[PDB]
Write a protein that binds this ligand. Structure first.
Ligand SMILES: N[C@H](CCC[C@H](N)C(=O)O)C(=O)O
Length: 420
């Protein structure tokens, strides 16, 4: 369920004019710095020459359950691995990406407890900790396009250390010298990459940091490495923790579930009741689109959670039903003017709306009621904001309401009205 997304120049011909980086995060599902950094990179950066291939979350099932690894430690599965392991197919996908001839370098992002120090200081600051370090398996990889791992790492670290938020967050180099006997790292992703003659690096941001600070450091590491590779790029924001926080918590983010209208990710009520979902369909098979890359659905008891990374955006209490795709549009009067409103759209209303009757279709405006009928048809009513019971809104702001259409016990679609 992981996916690779390309960040490429507009002109295909420019792809071969600078190096190619494979950027990977989310091998552990409870390390949101890494997968929020890949998400922001995908949403807000442009690559002008060369290519950056991104797997924003390697372990998506585990991310959805805020779990380090549902099927074990995915980053110990790159050497010996039983074909029956549930993640065996995913590991082969990742290995195939790493080993492609077009890839020159690999950057793997993680979050880790404490702060790495080369010497022991205390329980939080010591050599067994991984927070805020930039990691190589060895100094050099003979046969790579860019064999000088140590020089790249030192220069990337220098770049990150020019932008520290507090001196305790200073980055240090960790060279695990993996081939010489680090049996754990011999099973990990970056060692596999070195063995395919790729330049491979890992960045670990401290779990002691708030998310926006972790993401800040991961973005510094990405930029530092891109600069070393001479992959030119732009971003549409200033790289500081306040801007990172604003971009993670962006009110323009949305999720489109199945053929339903887009809903905002943020400021939803915590529970959406009687929420139509296609019947006879496993939750991971329900289509979901977003302008973010780390959104999904997951079952929890009798609810379906909408997830944005590790963040719970709402709890759907599903109404499983056949989705009949026959209805494409509905005639509505909006602020006195008829228009044909597409099923699955959001229509802004300043004053009022009225749904024209349809022969075999009933409309239920959720939050509007004329009687206590259990299958209402609310076509033919002129409806204003003041007619709604506000607690039925999708949003905490009480402006967005669902209109659901039904045809003979099947669901014919939804339109949202947004009062502006
Ligand atoms: N804290 C991570 C570091 C892995 C660093 C590098 N070997 C990689 O594969 O990215 C781990 O213990 O899996």
């Amino acid at each position: 369920s992981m996916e690779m997304i390309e960040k490429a120049p507009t002109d295909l011909e420019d792809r071969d004019k600078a190096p190619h980086l494979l950027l990977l995060a989310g091998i552990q599902g409870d390390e949101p710095g890494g997968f929020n950094a890949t998400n922001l990179f995908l949403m807000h950066y442009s690559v002008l020459k060369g290519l950056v291939e991104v797997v924003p979350v390697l372990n998506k099932p585990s991310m959805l359950r805020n779990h380090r690894g549902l099927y074990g430690d995915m980053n110990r599965k790159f050497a010996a691995l039983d074909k029956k392991d549930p993640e065996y197919p995913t590991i082969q996908e990742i290995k195939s990406l790493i080993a492609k001839p077009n890839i020159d370098a690999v950057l793997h992002l993680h979050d880790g407890g404490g702060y790495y120090r080369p010497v022991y200081v205390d329980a939080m600051l010591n050599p067994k900790r991984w927070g805020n370090c930039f990691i190589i398996d060895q100094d050099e990889v003979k046969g790579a396009k860019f064999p000088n791992l140590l020089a790249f790492a030192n220069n990337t670290i220098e770049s990150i250390n020019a932008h520290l938020l507090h001196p305790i967050e200073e980055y240090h180099l960790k060279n695990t010298r993996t081939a010489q006997g680090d049996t754990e790292m011999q099973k990990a992703l970056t060692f596999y990459a070195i063995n395919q003659k790729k330049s491979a690096f890992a960045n670990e941001a401290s779990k002691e940091l708030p998310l926006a600070s972790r993401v800040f450091y991961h973005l510094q590491a990405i930029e530092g490495l891109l600069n070393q590779l001479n992959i030119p790029f732009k971003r549409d924001f200033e790289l500081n923790p306040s801007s990172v926080h604003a971009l993670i918590n962006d009110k323009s983010l949305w999720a489109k579930i199945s053929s339903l209208p887009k809903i905002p990710l943020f400021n939803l009520r915590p529970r959406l009741n009687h929420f139509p979902l296609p019947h006879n369909t496993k939750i991971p098979q329900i289509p979901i689109e977003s302008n973010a890359y780390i959104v999904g659905l997951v079952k929890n008891k009798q609810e379906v959670f909408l997830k944005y990374g590790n963040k719970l955006m709402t709890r759907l209490s599903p109404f499983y039903i056949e989705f009949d795709p026959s209805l494409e549009e509905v005639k509505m009067q909006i602020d006195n003017k008829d228009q044909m409103v597409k099923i699955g759209s959001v229509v802004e209303v300043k004053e009022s709306f009225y749904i024209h009757a349809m022969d075999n279709i009933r409309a239920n405006v959720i939050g509007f009621s004329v009687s206590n009928e259990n299958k209402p048809n609310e076509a033919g009513y002129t409806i204003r904001f003041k007619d709604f019971q506000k607690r039925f809104s999708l949003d905490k702001q009480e402006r967005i309401y669902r209109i659901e259409f039904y045809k003979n016990n099947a669901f014919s679609g939804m339109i949202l009205v947004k009062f502006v």
